[PDB]
Design a protein around this ligand. Structure first.
Ligand SMILES: [Mg+2]
Ligand SMILES: [Mg+2]
Ligand SMILES: [Mg+2]
Ligand SMILES: [Mg+2]
Ligand SMILES: [Mg+2]
Ligand SMILES: [Mg+2]
Ligand SMILES: [Mg+2]
Ligand SMILES: [Mg+2]
Ligand SMILES: [Mg+2]
Ligand SMILES: [Mg+2]
Ligand SMILES: [Mg+2]
Ligand SMILES: [Mg+2]
Ligand SMILES: [Mg+2]
Lengths: 427, 429
């Protein structure tokens, strides 16, 4: 009936609203291949969960009908968690497969090796269209994709790439060398997870040839896997903006005690800094005593500082991740972003000055005013160079979180504001 | 030597060197490049740059380029001119051949960020009254003018959709077997009015490299590729990011946007926020009768306000993302309200013990509860605020990525004070 009608995705989507037991049985019941595709797009936590529960026959079932790059991710899940059971889990496989998966684990999850599958179709050099097809057909059953064929040499090293679209349009008796493409865009096995995703997206590829530390083709990567990178890349970037520093943190799958350990770290760095603010206020207590109104404006003043700093740091952290801007550009961003703050100040001061005034304090109006078009100015430039600097230091500009740029706009905002008051008090 | 040492060079190599090329060099290269490469270069540029070169480049190279360009891509570069110069748009569809300009008229009509927007009519389609032999025979004669022959879609006498074939299959199958034998009626499709982002959700789930597009009747009018849905994924996300930092412009390309442009982008939410924060000025002066008695009090206002503002930024992000990743149900808010409730108290305490430490050491033992106790009540509240704000903002029908960090702080001031200056109105009397 429907045991062949339902798609894995159907069961995936409703997984979010399915009882664990029911979910469990649907792993024993489905076809081998469908049972494997489901346990394939589950959270690494649930994966290692069902690999423990499911029976030893349905276990070896999944482990076989599962892709090799996918299998590694799943075993690596168990490895991290229950390591004892990991080695046992890895016992169910056969010699050739285990020694295949084993080689994948030794690659960094975040690099090419940790993203590639060995099931790629690669022919030797001097065959023909018609031969390559007969090969493809014979190799197809176990390949990940036969849509791109890689031409290696007698030492295993990439020498060309072949489109199945090409073989299909070509006289079968034409030698592939004269239709394959020699400039094989590729990545190494250390190549970064994100470094791949760019290439994939850049050249419009759907498959990418990973060569080993020695140019020998050793696996391929598929875009559908890069999609998952991308999303997890951006998810990390966003998480790094709001100042949470767990790259692999899923909200629903994480408790209080764990949410504590994740957020508390940056709130203790930032408040140590934000303390400099109290001290800074005390230093200017003569000026805070004389004219009382000065403090009445610290919030709206200091805060419109951090908002400005956010926007520009935000606007720049991404141009860097999006490769829209490079480190060689700072000295130009400065100019542009500098005449942008000045303008952003003029605008926002003309607005606050009106409040200061209507507030009933027409005397410290220039103080407040001139203090904005000096805060909005530097707040800007700061957020607009903190990432640029972290790059030149070899650091993740995403660490230039919005909170960090805000806490740092306080230490500065006061120093600007108060220091400009104490100067105006002299007159 | 211009069409030689350069003849080889990849349009991508050329693209990477783009920002490093003058507004005059990018022109002569754009006018010299083999017609094919030139259009691949124009192809990925920004609507603003394209529409520049589709005007300044000579009428001939204009013709060449215009034509040797993917259909869905042509449609874009067209619309990119419709906005800037509605005039040139239709004097430029004159460089087109009645057939090419046909699919285009029908393509622009669709919304840029809808399914129909990113789709192309260069899909291969067939009838069930066929056999593997003929589909292959048919592919061969239809391939050079298609986007992809790896996926074949079968239609009926009227044009509706009926199933999908993977070329992989048409190569492991026997040439004599029927076509409706190996196809799939379980064919997942997408409406023409479907959302740019929702499309990229499917194609990401189903590990699809292609997706069909129907109208309100189930016909087949085009397809969408994952190469184009890849860029989308970036956009939607990299726009979500701008929407965190109170920048609110669609496809903002900083590298190409000048002062006025950026000014136009950032000013709107700066204003909104400043005269939202002004509420703290009047909050301060409706409380100067309390502030006057204790000097040592305002010394801490920043450390107290700009902490909960960070706290609110954290809870906010996680939830906002946990929403856009489809991770959190709109009906998980009661579960988050209860969850975060304890973390913000557990965060509050660990943080107070630190501030109280300084408040004391600082030289103001006068009374730490007035400060330390306020801190807990702010870190508690602000947290629960940045959490439920993206929640509420959804049920109303609004992009929860609008609960931008700046907004969360600005809003956490107007609340931070009220809490603090009340624990100093009570703890004082
Ligand atoms: Mg990384
Ligand atoms: Mg891996
Ligand atoms: Mg692309
Ligand atoms: Mg293309
Ligand atoms: Mg894969
Ligand atoms: Mg990053
Ligand atoms: Mg949208
Ligand atoms: Mg489009
Ligand atoms: Mg996927
Ligand atoms: Mg798969
Ligand atoms: Mg396309
Ligand atoms: Mg969005
Ligand atoms: Mg603040």
């Amino acid at each position: 009936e429907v045991l062949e009608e339902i798609h894995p995705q159907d069961l995936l989507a409703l997984w979010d609203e399915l009882k664990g037991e029911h979910r469990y049985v649907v792993l024993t019941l489905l076809p081998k291949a469908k049972a494997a595709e489901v346990l394939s797009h589950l959270s690494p936590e649930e994966q290692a969960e069902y690999l423990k529960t499911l029976p030893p026959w349905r276990l070896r079932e999944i482990l076989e009908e599962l892709s090799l790059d996918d299998l590694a991710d799943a075993l690596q899940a168990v490895r991290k968690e229950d390591p004892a059971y990991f080695q046992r889990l890895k016992d169910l496989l056969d010699p050739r497969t285990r020694a295949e998966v084993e080689a994948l684990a030794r690659y960094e999850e975040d690099e090419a090796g940790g993203l590639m599958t060995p099931e790629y179709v690669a022919v030797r050099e001097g065959m023909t269209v018609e031969e390559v097809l007969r090969f493809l057909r014979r190799a197809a059953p176990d390949a990940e994709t036969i849509y791109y064929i890689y031409v290696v040499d007698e030492k295993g090293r990439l020498k060309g790439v072949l489109s199945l679209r090409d073989l299909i349009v070509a006289d079968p008796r034409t030698r592939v060398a004269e239709i394959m493409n020699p400039k094989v865009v590729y990545v190494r096995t250390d190549t970064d997870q994100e470094e791949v995703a760019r290439l994939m997206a850049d050249y419009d590829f759907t498959v990418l040839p990973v060569v080993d530390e020695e140019g020998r083709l050793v696996g391929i990567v598929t875009v559908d896997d890069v999609l998952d990178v991308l999303e997890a890349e951006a998810t990390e970037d966003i998480h790094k903006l709001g100042a949470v520093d767990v790259p692999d943190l899923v909200y629903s799958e994480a408790g209080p005690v764990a949410l504590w350990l994740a957020r508390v770290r940056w709130l203790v760095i930032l408040i140590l800094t934000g303390m400099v603010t109290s001290s800074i206020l005390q230093g200017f207590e003569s000026v805070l005593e004389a004219v009382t109104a000065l403090a009445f404006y610290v919030p709206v003043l200091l805060g419109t500082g951090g908002n400005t700093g956010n926007q520009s740091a935000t606007l720049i952290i991404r141009a860097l991740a999006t490769r829209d801007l490079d480190l060689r550009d700072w000295r130009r961003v400065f100019l542009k972003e500098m005449g942008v703050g000045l303008l952003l100040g003029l605008t926002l001061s003309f607005l606050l000055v009106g409040k200061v005034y209507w507030d009933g304090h027409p005397l410290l109006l220039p103080v407040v005013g001139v203090s904005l078009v000096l805060i909005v100015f530097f707040a800007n430039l700061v957020g607009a160079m903190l990432p640029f600097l972290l790059r030149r230091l070899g650091v993740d500009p995403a660490l230039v979180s919005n909170p960090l740029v805000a806490t740092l706009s306080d230490v500065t905002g006061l120093l600007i504001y108060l220091s400009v008051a104490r100067l105006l008090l002299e007159a």
